[PDB]
Amino acid sequence: TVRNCPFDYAHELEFDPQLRQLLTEEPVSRIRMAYGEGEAWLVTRYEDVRTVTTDRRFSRSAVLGRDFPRMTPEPIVQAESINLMDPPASSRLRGLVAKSFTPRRVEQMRGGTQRVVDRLLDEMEEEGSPADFVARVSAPLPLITICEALDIPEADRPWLRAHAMTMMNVGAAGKQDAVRAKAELRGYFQELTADRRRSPGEDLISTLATARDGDELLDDDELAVMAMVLLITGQDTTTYQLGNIAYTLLTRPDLLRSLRAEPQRLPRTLEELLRHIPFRKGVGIPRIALEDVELSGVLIKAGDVVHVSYLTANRDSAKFDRPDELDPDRPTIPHMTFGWGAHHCLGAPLATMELEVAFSTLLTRFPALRLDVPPEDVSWNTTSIWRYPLALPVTW
Numbered sequence: 001t002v003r004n005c006p007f008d009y010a011h012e013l014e015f016d017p018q019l020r021q022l023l024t025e026e027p028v029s030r031i032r033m034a035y036g037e038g039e040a041w042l043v044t045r046y047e048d049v050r051t052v053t054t055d056r057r058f059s060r061s062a063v064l065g066r067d068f069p070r071m072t073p074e075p076i077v078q079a080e081s082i083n084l085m086d087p088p089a090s091s092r093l094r095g096l097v098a099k100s101f102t103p104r105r106v107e108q109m110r111g112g113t114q115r116v117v118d119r120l121l122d123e124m125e126e127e128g129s130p131a132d133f134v135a136r137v138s139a140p141l142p143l144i145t146i147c148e149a150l151d152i153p154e155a156d157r158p159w160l161r162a163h164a165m166t167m168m169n170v171g172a173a174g175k176q177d178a179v180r181a182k183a184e185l186r187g188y189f190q191e192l193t194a195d196r197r198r199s200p201g202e203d204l205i206s207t208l209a210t211a212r213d214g215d216e217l218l219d220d221d222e223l224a225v226m227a228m229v230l231l232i233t234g235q236d237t238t239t240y241q242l243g244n245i246a247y248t249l250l251t252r253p254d255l256l257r258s259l260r261a262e263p264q265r266l267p268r269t270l271e272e273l274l275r276h277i278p279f280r281k282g283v284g285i286p287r288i289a290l291e292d293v294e295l296s297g298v299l300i301k302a303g304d305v306v307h308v309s310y311l312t313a314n315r316d317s318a319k320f321d322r323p324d325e326l327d328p329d330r331p332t333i334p335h336m337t338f339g340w341g342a343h344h345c346l347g348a349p350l351a352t353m354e355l356e357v358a359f360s361t362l363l364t365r366f367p368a369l370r371l372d373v374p375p376e377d378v379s380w381n382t383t384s385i386w387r388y389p390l391a392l393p394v395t396w
């Protein structure tokens with residue numbers, strides 16, 4: 001009665017058939033994952049994911065100390081992270097970093113991001129066709145963006161990203177590498193944040209370090225971990241989504257033609273691309289039931305582990321008509337690709353702006369952009385919790 005879920009489906013950007021079957025046939029189910037102990041509930045329907053991520057009887061703080069069902073042999077989350085805080089404690093720190101991503105703030109960052117994108121595309125154009133869109137655009141843009149915000153020295157950026165990637169590996173033998181990568185990244189940020197708290201500058205880390213409401217909002221360890229979390233989160237999914245969206249556009253000719261004909265369609269089209277693309281393998285950080293709760297007729301016991309699938313929520317026909325169709329003109333309904341509820345993505349406005357600047361500029365600068373290989377020759381990542389193309393040869 002307990003499903004085996006290695007969550008290793010990795011075929012292109014096709015939806016995981018196991019996740020689709022559970023959404024359809026067993027929407028609240030018991031699963032066993034690659035690592036951690038015991039079973040977990042898996043919640044798949046949009047309305048039920050909405051419940052689990054907002055109802056205060058499902059807790060992230062209670063995950064602390066558990067060897068919880070998960071996809072990587074060492075957990076990516078850290079003890080002091082915002083991910084493992086509950087409201088109202090999580091609200092104050094979420095509100096603090098959200099201040100750095102207000103609508104005025106990201107629109108004041110947009111000019112600088114436009115200049116980065118212009119330079120990346122200049123360099124790609126100078127090297128000449130064909131090129132790897134991953135190496136030239138999707139990999140560098142988010143790393144530059146978050147490292148400029150955190151004021152990270154350019155010389156350190158490859159080392160930081162390499163360590164973050166090690167933590168995302170699902171292979172069992174990589175556990176000790178992942179433990180070491182997490183410890184070395186934590187040490188880097190403990191030292192860096194201590195320096196910025198001691199001697200503040202005008203960067204984001206200094207802003208977080210000096211924030212007070214009587215006491216400092218972040219103690220020394222919370223500050224170190226928050227800077228580390230912002231680096232890690234800022235440079236993975238946005239890189240992978242730039243690549244996933246590029247592949248999708250370059251293999252959907254009517255959709256790409258529509259964006260070339262009417263570029264003002266891009267913001268709404270990007271929202272539908274985000275809803276549709278299965279950008280991760282499996283499921284992420286669970287929650288713990290704090291007491292017995294009957295979720296859509298299923299009794300979840302106090303202490304049980306509860307996982308949500310945002311990917312199945314995005315394909316729930318109860319919410320999205322013809323959910324497997326990529327339809328940029330469909331009625332607008334909030335998707336779950338940035339999560340939901342108390343832990344909704346803090347970087348969503350920044351990621352959205354990066355996607356809009358990159359693709360709006362790409363589409364006008366390279367009107368003959370095409371994939372330079374048959375789509376089936378594109379290789380897709382198997383080693384990570386994320387889904388992404390390893391390389392994307394393009395011509396123009």
Ligand code: HEM
Binds near residue numbers: 284310339344
């Ligand atoms: C297309 C790009 C992105 C996607 C699809 C994405 C998606 C997500 C998802 C699914 C979650 C988890 C929600 C949960 O735990 O239930 C999350 C959380 C988070 N994201 Fe993102 N994200 C993106 C970009 C970013 C960026 C650029 C940043 C930082 C600059 C960022 C920072 C965070 C943080 C700090 C959290 C944890 C929030 C909390 O637990 O309170 N994300 N994101």
